[PDB]
Amino acid sequence: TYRNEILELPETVAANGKFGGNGVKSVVGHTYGAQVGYIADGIFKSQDEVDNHATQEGAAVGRIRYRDIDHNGVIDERDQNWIYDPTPSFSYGLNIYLE
Amino acid sequence: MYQSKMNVLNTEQYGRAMWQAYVNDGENPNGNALGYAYNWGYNADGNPVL
Amino acid sequence: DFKSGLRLDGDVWVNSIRLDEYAGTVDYQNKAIVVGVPYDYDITRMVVTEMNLSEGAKASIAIGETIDFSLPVSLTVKNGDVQMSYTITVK
Amino acid sequence: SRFFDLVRWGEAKDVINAYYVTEASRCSIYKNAGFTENKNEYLPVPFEQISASNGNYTQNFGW
Amino acid sequence: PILTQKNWDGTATYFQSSDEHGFSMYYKPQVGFVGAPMPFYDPVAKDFKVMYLQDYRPNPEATYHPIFGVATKDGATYESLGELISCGGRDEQDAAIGTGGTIYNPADKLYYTFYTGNKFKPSSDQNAQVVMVATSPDFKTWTKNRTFYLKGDTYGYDKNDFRDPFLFQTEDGVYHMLIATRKNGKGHIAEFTSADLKEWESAGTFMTMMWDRFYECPDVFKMGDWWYLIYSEQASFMRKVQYFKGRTLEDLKATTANDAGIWPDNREGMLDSRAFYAGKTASDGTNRYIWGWCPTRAGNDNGNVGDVEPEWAGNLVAQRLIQHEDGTLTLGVPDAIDRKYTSAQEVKVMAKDGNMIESGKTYTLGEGASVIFNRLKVHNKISFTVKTASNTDRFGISFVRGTDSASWYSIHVNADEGKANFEKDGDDAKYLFDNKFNIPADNEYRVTIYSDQSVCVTYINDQLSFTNRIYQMQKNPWSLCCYKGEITVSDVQVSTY
Ligand SMILES: OC[C@H]1O[C@@](CO)(OC[C@H]2O[C@@](CO)(OC[C@H]3O[C@@](CO)(OC[C@H]4O[C@@](CO)(OC[C@H]5O[C@](O)(CO)[C@@H](O)[C@@H]5O)[C@@H](O)[C@@H]4O)[C@@H](O)[C@@H]3O)[C@@H](O)[C@@H]2O)[C@@H](O)[C@@H]1O
Ligand SMILES: [Mg+2]
């Protein structure tokens, strides 16, 4: 097992997100290749659910519901967090030889 | 041998999916203009069926 | 069980128009059947006598029925679930 | 140049809203279309550029 | 994921609601919109089989407007039988199907539906509109008779104006078809008699229209002791539904025979406002129900009624015909629709802006005072009673009303003007349309609003019926206001299901 972390990075690289963050948040302090995205809290199943959820563009019955991270009442760019980590918990292997 | 054969829609499944998308969006599926003619109706609850 | 019950492998064609006692030409590119009659003809009462098609092909217009041909008439040929639409006009 | 002319003249919001309302009948794309008075008449400054030049670029009004 | 529920009951802030693709009470299919209802009573199934035209926002340029069947028995519940009669080819005369009629023949156990086919881009020698017939053995599958072509120009009528075949059988045993056509620049409802519905004889002209107007979807019937002709005015400035009364068929024909103007009542035969069109009636033997379509608004704006004439098609709306002792006709809520509302919702005041006072269920309002209630739901039934000081008061019911609502849409019942007016209040103060009705002499009004999603029908003391398309009205507060007189409102009850 192993853990990877980026400690320093040029400002332009952190902004463009070549090494992670998708250009939304800086990858510094996170694993190499980590990605920032929305959080899908299931799908809408009724107009009552759509109305109860925070307002978002294109919300309708049967559509993906996105969590409001900052609880501002509207889904926008700021409602994104760290969702992807390309680091396995542990990698193992086993070899058996029977004669 | 190829094992991870990705499952994709055949002709009937593709037509069914297109009809489902059209009726979900409220447009007329017969207007697909892809050569598909759909015989379809509504059930007791009003949900479209093909 | 991957195969779907579509039986699409079926030929659909029309190759015989026999309105009353008149023949006509068929253009498959434009899906048209054009039948010529003299300048004086009743046209309001035409019967279909010979409308053979490809093997297993079924058409909406049957034999023995009468159709007014003052305007182009749409015909649908459906051997299975494969359909083809032509238009029949009379000059 | 039509959009730039509308923005320069200042009637861009009204013209675009009227166009949306008129064309929603014959086009379903404009079903949810809506123009904001002081936001949508100029493209926002790119977020990547703002982040790269920290404390130097200010986003346009309304964004 | 834990779902969060907002405080719907307890807030009066304006909320952006939405309309589902399907409707339950005022029927609307999940796909397309209802236009030009064609009601019919099935003698076998003992129910109501209303057909219509399935309009779409992107209609095809050549072939469109098929016929879809809807089965009902009470006017509240509706099931769909799918497409019944399909539109023809591009070059066929029935590329676009117009409004028609339906009649059953026990002689051959066959349903005959007579519709209107519209030629796409007709030529000079081609009739624009032709009446056709389709036969069904069990109302499910329909076969069009290709040998039937009732050309309008054959009998000297207009080629481009030959519409709305309405069929009815009289006691003598002969079927009569009424066609709303034009002759030598004058609107004529022509009559064709038949004994087997296969051969027709033009029995002259049934009736003439009033002041060179056009009548859409004529419907002649008999209700007890009077003969009634329901029609829809095609004139852009009117765009409403009127009717004519007559003791016998001869009297009905003699009505407006030549600019006579024998109006059935003092309101020129008004039934409903601009939001109700193509009203056609059918009777099951005990009650008569009229079906029409409430139109939609472009851009989902209630104030965007539109110039000349509104948008076509919309939501199917069913009302119950009520015949008074003088022969006048008024529209009432169907009994099934009224009884469907079972659950009751508590009502309480949200805003206190005017000088009104509260004494329990009774609220007294002066001029310039208004009261705002709690939010509504998807389906609402609001019933109350308003007593005015005199017969010159202006009270009103406002929907899409909130604390921060810049504009709200109101119906003002003006007793001095003797009518009701649907207008837009707020920062625009726009007048949309109106509807005349009979002012009670006791200054008492029994107001009942039945609203499904975005279509609401208001009934005033069984004397006024007022249909409206008000988007965003569901899940939003409603208010009562007074402008010039003094009013006292009581018995406010809100029911939802
Ligand atoms: O499809 C194009 C666009 O316009 C509509 C408006 O309905 O479709 C037009 C299309 O509808 C037909 C049959 O499909 O008639 C509509 C049916 O509804 C009736 C009322 O019962 O007519 C009301 C409707 O007719 C209008 C506009 O169509 O005027 C009729 C028009 O026909 C003339 O003859 C043209 O030469 C003129 O008399 C007049 O200008 C308008 O007054 C009303 O809104 C029935 O009469 C009829 O059965 C066809 O008649 C027409 O071509 C929409 O569907 C679509 O968005
Ligand atoms: Mg947020």
**In the sheet where E419-424 sits, what is the strand order?**
E351-352, E370-375, E477-482, E394-399, E409-414, E419-424, E430-436
**Residue E225 Cα to ligand 1 middle (Å):** 35
Residue E407 · residue E424 · CB < 8 Å: yes
- Tokens of residue E27, six digits: 């029927």
Helix (H, G, I), strand (E, B) or coil at B20: helix
Helix (H), strand (E) counts: chain A:
2, 4
Torsion region of E282: left, alpha or beta (phi above 0 gives left; psi -120 to 50 gives alpha): beta
Whole-number Å distance between alpha carbons of B19 and B25: 10
For residue A7, the distance in angstroms to the closest alpha carbon of chain E comes to: 33
Ligand nearest to the CA of A75: 2
Distances in Å between the Cα of E387 and the Cα atoms of C75, E395, E446, E447, E490 are 67, 10, 9, 11, 9
Contact E229, E220 (CB under 8 A): yes
Pick from D32, D47, D52: which is nearest to A12 by CB? D52
Ligand 1 pocket test target in E34, E312, E316 with most atoms within 8 Å of CB:
E312
Size of chain A in residues: 99
Question: Which residue carries 């253009």 as its tokens?
Answer: C27
| E139 and E69 Cβ atoms separated by less than 8 Å | yes
- On chain B, the residues whose CB falls within 8 A of the CB of C2 are 10
D interface test, pick of A9, A12, A55 with most D CB neighbours within 10 Å = A12
Query: CB-based contacts of E112: which residues, under 8 Å, 6+ apart?
Result: E102, E103, E104, E105, E133, E134, E135, E167, E197
Are E119 and E130 within 8 A, CB to CB? yes
Task: For residue E267, give the amino acid letter.
Answer: R
Q: Which of E110, E154, E111, E147 is nearest to E132 (CA)?
A: E147
Are E351 and E485 spatial neighbours (Cβ–Cβ below 8 Å)?
no
Q: Do E299 and D28 touch (CB under 8 A)?
A: no
Cβ–Cβ under 8 Å, residues B32 and B22: yes
Tell me how far apart the alpha carbons of residues C16 and E348 are, in angstroms, rounded to a whole number: 78
Ligand 1 contacts CB of residue E321 (under 6 A): no
- Other Cβ atoms closer than 10 A to E57: 18
Tell me if E334 sits within 8 A of E75, measured CB to CB.
yes
D30 annotated binding-site participant? yes
Strands (E), E259-378: 277-283, 288-295, 314-323, 329-332, 343-345, 351-352, 357-358, 363-365, 370-375
- Contact pairs from chain A to chain E, CB under 8 Å: 22
Cα separation values, E443 from C28, D26, E391, E466, E489, Å: 76, 47, 6, 19, 12
Q: How many CA atoms lie within 13 A of B13 on its CB side?
A: 7
Partner-chain contact E91 C72, CB within 8 Å = yes
Quote the minimal CA–CA distance from E140 to chain B in Å: 12
Question: Is E150 exposed, middle or buried, given 0-12, 13-18 or 19+ CB atoms closer than 10 A?
Answer: buried
Reported for E120-126, long-range contacts at CB under 8 A and 24+ positions apart, including other chains, are E120/E61, E120/E62, E120/E63, E120/E90, E120/E91, E120/E95, E120/E96, E122/E159, E122/E160, E126/C71, E126/E93
E232 phi and psi, to 5 degrees?
Answer: -110, 125
Lookup: tokens for E43:
């003698």
CB distance E278 to ligand 1 below 6 Å: yes
CB under 8 Å to C70, separation ≥6 — which residues?
Answer: C43, C44, E149
Q: Chain A closest CA to D54's CA: distance in Å?
A: 8
Two structure tokens written together for E302? 């209630």
DSSP letters spanning D5-52: HHHHHT-HHHHHHHHHHHHTTT-SGGGS----TTTTTSPPPPHHHHHH
- A15 touching chain D per CB within 8 A: yes
Q: Mutate which of A11, A22, A55 to test chain D, going by most D C-beta atoms within 10 A?
A: A11
Q: Do D21 and E304 touch (CB under 8 A)?
A: yes
Q: Do chains C and D touch (3 or more CB pairs under 8 A)?
A: no
Angle of helix D2-9 versus helix D12-23 axis, rounded to 10: 130
Provide DSSP, E414-465: ETTTTEEEEEE-SSS-EEEEEEE-PPPTTSEEEEEEEEETTEEEEEETTTEE
Cβ of residue E134 lying under 6 Å from some atom of ligand 1? no
Which residues partner with A21 through β-bridges?
none
Yes or no: say if E69 and E60 are a contact pair by the CB < 8 Å rule. no
Is the distance from the beta carbon of residue E99 to the nearest atom of ligand 1 less than 6 Å? Answer: yes
Distance CA E235, CA E187 (A): 12
Hey, what amino acid is at E455?
V
Query: Does residue E55's CB lie within 6 angstroms of at least one atom of ligand 1?
Result: yes
| Tokens of residue E45, six digits | 């199934």
